[PDB]
A and B are shown apart, each in its own frame.
Chain A
Amino acid sequence: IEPIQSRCAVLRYTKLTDAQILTRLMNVIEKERVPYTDDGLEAIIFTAQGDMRQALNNLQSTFSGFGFINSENVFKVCDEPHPLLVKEMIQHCVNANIDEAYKILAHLWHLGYSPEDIIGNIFRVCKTFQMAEYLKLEFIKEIGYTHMKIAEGVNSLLQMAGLLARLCQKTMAP
């Protein structure tokens, strides 16, 4: 509440820069004697996404499972972050390109992601995406209309493809 925040110096922490994670990664690596490559540590930083707990967890998992930090050893047990692909698929939906958007949607579907998580990351990407304001508003309305159908019980690849096609229709309908 506001009276508690007025009683303090409200300090605000930002998400960690990759070099700031990288320095403590050097620290943990030299006290733990972890063999590594540079690209594997960029993969660890990419999987962490500003989270130092996730960086240490993924580094320990890659060191315990394989004993060496390259890119494909990291990506064998960790995963690429989900909304970085959702940003490119929303960008493909912006230029009314249904084929690449469905390619990314089917890739995320075959990875085992539930429709709720996919539509939530779609809404978070469309929240901060760079387009027109009215186009963003009708996109958010379409996302909520599809999320109603997801919530009532019907959740298949056909509903998500229909959402993608309606988002492509919103661009071509001024």
Chain B
Amino acid sequence: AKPVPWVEKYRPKCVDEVAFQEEVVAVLKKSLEGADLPNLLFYGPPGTGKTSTILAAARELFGPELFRLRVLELNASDERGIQVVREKVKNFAQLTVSGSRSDGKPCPPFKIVILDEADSMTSAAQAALRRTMEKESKTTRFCLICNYVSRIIEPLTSRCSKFRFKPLSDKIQQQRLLDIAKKENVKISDEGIAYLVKVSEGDLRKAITFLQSATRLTGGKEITEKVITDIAGVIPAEKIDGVFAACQSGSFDKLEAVVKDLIDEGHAATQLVNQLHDVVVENNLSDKQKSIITEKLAEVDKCLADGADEHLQLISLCATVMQQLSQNC
């Protein structure tokens, strides 16, 4: 009777528990009925449900007794070189489908190879997979899971039926979070759940983690909007107004001061980029100023994506929008 965190406790065990990915869920449901399951490719933003859908599907198709004999799951946490693809994947794909389910539920006549996080596979190791799927598809199936389809080579993209996992809508995420909160004997206000589905941005794992952490922080009382704001790392609006006041001042000393304030208070630059962009696209600036400020925001977000330093990127973006605000002064 050990405690289990809510991201694994509420992990879909069946295909009907997956939310908002309607087309692929219907595809696997017809495959559950007995239709011809093709080779699958799952790609999209994190937290959308790529791993859980195929794991619940394989549990549905094979049951508990046939998961070890029909499913080979490979991730980036183990070694996937050219030799692992050439030996281990090929020997598994050349195996026989033997063993039926003992509960009377139908058993599919194929195996499933789950290559989760297939961006990390090399281009040479992906090239060795092609005729493995072309030749041994009578007795096995392949499911590649990734986040960026550009990291998958075009033969492997062409061989697999691509399903894009969309970011979750506000409505479906709201009902799923409300159902999880109802099942856990906890309460949350309308503004709190609205701010939760605004913060999570289609990430159900992040939403469940924030809901569980707010439940543990409050202890079981009302989960209001303020615990959501201080649990998400959301920068307060006064800091953004101070940043824009320092930008409209036209002096680099106050700009450095507020950038050092935001760096020293532990605020992430991704959250500052998001909130800054939300302020710029919703004010009375000119179209040219908004255009090059948003272009600088895109290039700063890209430079933060390759792990550059926070302070220098923030001082460059703040210098650019300072120049844009002080050009018309």
Contacts and interface: CB of A to CB of B under 8 A. Distances in A.
Contacts of A154: 150
Nearest to B148: A153
Contacts of B148: 153
A154 B151 CA distance: 7
Interface size class of B (residues with CB under 8 A): under 10
Interface residues of A, number: 3
Most buried by A among B150, B151, B152: B150
Interface string B139-152: 00000000010111
Contacts of A153: 148, 150-152
Nearest to A151: B123
Contacts of B151: 153
Interface string A140-160: 000000000000011100000
A154 B150 CA distance: 5
A153 B150 CA distance: 5
B118 to A, nearest CB: 12
Nearest to B149: A153
B150 to A, nearest CB: 4
A147 to B, nearest CB: 14
Contacts of B152: 153
B153 to A, nearest CB: 8
B129 to A, nearest CB: 16
A39 to B, nearest CB: 38
Interface in A99-157: 153-155
Nearest to B119: A153
B146 to A, nearest CB: 11
Nearest to A156: B150
A37 B152 CA distance: 48
Contacts of A155: 154
Interface string A4-34: 0000000000000000000000000000000
A154 B148 CA distance: 10
A155 B154 CA distance: 10
A155 B152 CA distance: 11
Contacts of B154: 155
B76 to A, nearest CB: 16
Interface in B55-102: none
A109 to B, nearest CB: 13
A112 to B, nearest CB: 12
A155 B157 CA distance: 13
A12 to B, nearest CB: 36
A56 B148 CA distance: 46
A155 B150 CA distance: 8
Interface in B143-179: 148, 150-152, 154
Nearest to B152: A153
A153 B152 CA distance: 7
A154 B123 CA distance: 13
Nearest to B151: A153
B41 to A, nearest CB: 15
A155 B153 CA distance: 10
A85 to B, nearest CB: 23
A144 to B, nearest CB: 19
Interface of A: 153-155
Closest 5 CB pairs of A and B: A153-B150, A154-B150, A153-B151, A153-B148, A153-B152
6 contacts: A153-B148, A153-B150, A153-B151, A153-B152, A154-B150, A155-B154
